[PDB]
Amino acid sequence: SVSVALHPLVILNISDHWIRMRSQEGRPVQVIGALIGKQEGRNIEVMNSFELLSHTVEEKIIIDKEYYYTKEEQFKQVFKELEFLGWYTTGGPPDPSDIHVHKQVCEIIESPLFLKLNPMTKHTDLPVSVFESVIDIINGEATMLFAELTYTLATEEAERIGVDHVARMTNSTVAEHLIAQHSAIKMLHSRVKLILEYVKASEAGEVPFNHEILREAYALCHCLPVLSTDKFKTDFYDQCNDVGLMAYLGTITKTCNTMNQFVNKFNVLYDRQ
């Protein structure tokens, strides 16, 4: 059980790989690639991901270890602090072919991860799923299977700006800033209102009484206000006063410029040369 942090760059890489292969081959085909990231204690984070070269004989898939090693040297040349983490594929639920390829990959690292992306999906949530290998004994026979992990989307400023720009692709400045904040606050409002409705509907009586959801709603309601402490208030007011002083200096500079223009015009008009 290790906490996993995902990066939208990995998902974009996988989707572009699949789209490119489908367009090149005329018909959809599954792709196999590798992941790259950093592990700190029990926190695994993925950052980038390249593609691996594979062949099929009979009904089995084999990965070119020579190509993998050349790519490993190439990526270590650039990303010095990054390391191998696992492999990724496109499809549905795991298959015996996936178990075979995982067994093949396990000869390289100790416990590689496994990422699965589903291009053809009908659900509402992201089709990305993360698995790890677990070896068990069932009915006196040794078999290694998959265990699903829970992943969180990692935070990065440049990544956030790039992803938002790509998703949006669209006459002031306050305008734009406030519009972005508005979109996010709108999402929050929607979600909190749907939760309040469920809670009110459950209280009046319209849906079966659920205890876990109501307890979690109580816990959520007990989390407000967030950080009402004196040290936080002092830090917040420090920031506010700093920005206020910067705005004061900027206003003074602008007024000095306007004053200079007025003085120039007055000197030109009311002087006899």
């Binding site: 606050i185 409002h189 309040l196 709603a217 309601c221």
Partner: protein, 213 residues
């Protein structure tokens, strides 16, 4: 989920078997919310008879505190060390639900601990149970809680939930309205300034044209 198994195996039991099962589930590690067991019609019917003490104990463990147990020690049946530890953990959770920076004095008073080492060991155990996430500050005599689980709720508590969620929704709507108004004001100001500058330039051009002729 041990509570699901305890509910499943509690269908046919009653009386002494029910009380023994209640004691076992209260002593069982890991389970910290007892809502469905209290919701059981059989358990709620246990009130009539001479075993209402066990129902009162279950109610105390669902919604209760160590000072409540101390005040009602005589009526309730005796509890073992594991049950007392669970009640202390639930007291810590109840305090952290309403206060996010708990002083040491109130914790010591509530849990009836004598030295700081016992209280800090208890808080460390509660943290390790993954039912409360926080840090201990010795210099200021504080415990700072980042996360605490939601304890059991009554039927009349949900009014507070709906009130708080209504307040949050109203705040979000007010913020959205303010953002819209500010955007409109900024755009209007920019367009007004541009129009005024253009008008002044046009007047200057007209004056120059009529003067140069």
């Amino acid at each position: 989920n041990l509570l699901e198994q305890f509910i499943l195996l509690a269908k046919g039991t009653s009386g002494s078997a029910l009380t023994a099962l209640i004691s076992q589930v209260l002593e069982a590690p890991g389970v910290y919310v007892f809502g469905e067991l209290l919701e059981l019609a059989n358990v709620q019917e246990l009130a009539e008879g001479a075993n209402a003490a066990y129902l009162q104990l279950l109610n105390l463990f669902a919604y209760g505190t160590y000072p409540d147990y101390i005040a009602n020690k005589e009526s309730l049946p005796e509890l073992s060390t594991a049950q007392q530890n669970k009640l202390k953990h639930l007291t810590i959770v109840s305090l952290a639900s309403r206060m996010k920076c708990i002083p040491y004095s109130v914790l010591l008073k509530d849990l009836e601990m004598r030295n700081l080492r016992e209280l800090e060991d208890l808080i460390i155990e509660a943290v390790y149970t993954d039912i409360i996430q926080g840090k201990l500050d010795q210099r200021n005599q504080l415990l700072e809680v980042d996360f605490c689980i939601g304890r059991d709720i009554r039927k009349k508590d949900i009014n507070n939930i709906v009130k708080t969620l209504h307040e949050w929704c109203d705040g979000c709507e007010a913020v959205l309205l303010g953002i819209e108004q500010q955007v409109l004001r900024a755009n209007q100001y920019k367009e007004n300034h541009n129009r005024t500058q253009q008008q002044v330039e046009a007047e200057v051009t007209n004056i120059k044209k009529t003067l140069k002729a």
